[PDB]
Amino acid sequence: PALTKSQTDRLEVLLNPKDEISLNSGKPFRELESELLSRRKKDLQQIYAEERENYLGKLEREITRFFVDRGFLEIKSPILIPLEYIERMGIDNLSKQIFRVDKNFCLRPMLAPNLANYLRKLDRALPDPIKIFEIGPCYRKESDGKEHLEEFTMLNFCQMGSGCTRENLESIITDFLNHLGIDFKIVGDSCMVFGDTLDVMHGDLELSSAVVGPIPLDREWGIDKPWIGAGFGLERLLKVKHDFKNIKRAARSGSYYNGISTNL
């Protein structure tokens, strides 16, 4: 017997990367589903008995320790931000990806503007160099695929003052991804907000865009020193680490817990 599209979709929801199970072996849907339901219940029971930590929360904590231990100040800034920040970042009417809230506010699509404000303010009080980072939710309307979510989690680390060179930026990226055990390469790209970026790639998957300033946009933000920064998506890091086929396995979700279907 042949499996319908609905049946294959249900098996794919229940399948995890570690399984070696052929969905098209000729065994009936009922037995494949029962086998995978049993495996997934066992997997969830093991998490509940022994770990209980959410992958996105746990990775945020691990990243936070890494940066705090390297001298970066942990930031938690607003997720709801002025729409004016979008304009001031050169996102001239990504502008179509912005979730608007009421009349003058939006959900932040990136962490950079709030971090630029912090760099400027902290430079009046703290010794050179200024090193800060933030992890938290960001939002973009996307044509949904296997690497994009509408609600995702960004890390951005940045530095202003001395030591803001391409080689230091690459060294921090390298130490960071070595800490996570993720192989990568650096390629040149370009984007509208920052211009040239160093994109951090795992295969064809973009883990990060990174920037060596100064750039002309700095004047609009009161930034007047050299700086470096990089933004990473946590769900993409999780996709690599766990070999997920689709990024939704990694997302904030009611449908998966640590990559395991919650429809059991």
Ligand X SMILES: N[C@@H](CCCCNC(=O)OCc1cccc(C2(C(F)(F)F)N=N2)c1)C(=O)O
Alpha carbons 56 and 213: distance in angstroms, whole number: 30
**209 sits in which H/E element:** strand 205-212
259 neighbors 54 (Cβ within 8 angstroms): no
- Angle, in degrees to the nearest 10, between helices 55-69 and 234-242: 110
Among 104, 62, 67, 73, smallest CA distance to 86 is for 104
Decide whether 27 or 120 has the Cβ nearer to its own copies: 120
Instruction: Work out whether 124 is an interface residue with its own copies (CB under 8 A).
Output: yes
The region of 8-16, 81-89, 131-139, 187-195 touching K ion under the rule CB under 5 A is 8-16
Instruction: Work out whether 83 is an interface residue with its own copies (CB under 8 A).
Output: no
Q: Which does 216 bind (CB under 5 to 8 A by kind): its own copies, Mg ion, ligand ATP, none?
A: none
Closest distance of CB 34 from its own copies, Å = 14
The region of 47-55, 202-210, 232-240, 244-252 touching Mg ion under the rule CB under 5 A is 202-210
Q: Which does 19 bind (CB under 5 to 8 A by kind): ligand X, its own copies, K ion, none?
A: K ion
Alpha carbons 187 and 198: distance in angstroms, whole number: 6
Amino acid, single-letter form, for residue 132:
I
Q: Binding ligand ATP by CB under 6 A: which of 27, 58, 120, 148?
A: 148
What residues are paired with 231 via a beta bridge? 156, 209
Q: Pattern 183-212, binding to ligand X, x per CB under 6 A?
A: --------x-xx--------------xxx-
Instruction: Write b or e for each residue in 233-252: b if 16 or more Cβ atoms lie within 10 A of its Cβ, otherwise e.
Output: bbbbbbbbeeebebbbbbbe
Q: How far is CA 100 from CA 49, 83, 94, 170, in A?
A: 41, 8, 13, 35
Instruction: Work out whether 202 is an interface residue with ligand ATP (CB under 6 A).
Output: no
158 neighbors 119 (Cβ within 8 angstroms): yes
Instruction: Work out whether 110 is an interface residue with ligand X (CB under 6 A).
Output: yes
Q: Binding ligand X by CB under 6 A: which of 229, 238, 248, 249?
A: 229
Q: Binding ligand X by CB under 6 A: which of 156, 172, 176, 261?
A: 156
Closest distance of CB 93 from Mg ion, Å = 17
Largest CA distance in the chain: 71
Among 168, 176, 158, 185, smallest CA distance to 63 is for 176
Instruction: Work out whether 261 is an interface residue with Mg ion (CB under 5 A).
Output: no
156 neighbors 186 (Cβ within 8 angstroms): no
Instruction: Work out whether 201 is an interface residue with its own copies (CB under 8 A).
Output: no
Residue 41 DSSP SS3: helix
User: What residues line the site for ligand X (CB under 6 A)?
Assistant: 89, 110, 112-113, 115-116, 119, 156, 158, 191, 193-194, 209-211, 213, 215, 217-218, 221, 223, 227, 229-231
User: What residues line the site for its own copies (CB under 8 A)?
Assistant: 40-41, 44-45, 47-48, 52-54, 56-58, 61, 64, 68, 71-80, 99-102, 107, 114, 117-118, 121-122, 124-127, 137, 139, 150-151, 252-254, 257, 262-264
